[PDB]
Amino acid sequence: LSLQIDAAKVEAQNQLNAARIAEIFNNMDLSKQSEFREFLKTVASFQQ
Amino acid sequence: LSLQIDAAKVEAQNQLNAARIAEIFNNMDLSKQSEFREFLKTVASFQQ
């Protein structure tokens, strides 16, 4: 009972970690570069 | 039982901390610089 329960929720946490962690690195870095293209967008409006 | 349960939820909280903390630093700083590009946007409307 506790064996397959705990192993099951262990793998559940495993998809939780792959999911959340990937969301972290991706969303953080890519949103940072979105702020980058946005800075360059405002500079583009300046050149306009 | 309590061993793999508590270790399991410890790593669960670990992804919770990486997730939420990264959300903090990123969203705060990047949204701050969004207020920056927004100030410069209003100044751009002034120059217009």
Max CA distance (Å), chain B: 68
CA distances B8 to A8, B11, B25, Å, are: 11, 5, 26
Residue A7: which residues within 8 A CB-CB, separation 6 or more?
A: B4
- The answer to whether A24 and B19 have CB atoms below 8 angstroms apart is yes
**To probe the interface with A, which of B37, B46, B47 has the most A CB atoms within 10 Å?**
B37
In angstroms, this model's resolution equals 7.0
d(CA B29, CA A31): 11
Residue whose token pair is 């405002």? A42
Sign (positive or negative) of CA dihedral B30, B32, B37, B41: positive
Q: What's B25's DSSP letter? A: H
DSSP string, B1-48: -HHHHHHHHHHHHHHHHHHHHHHHHHHHHHHHHHHHHHHHHHHHHHH-
Residues of B in contact with A42 (CB under 8 A): 37, 40-41, 44
CA–CA distance, B27 with B32 (Å, rounded to integer):
8
Contacts of B8 in chain A (CB under 8 A): 6, 9-10, 13
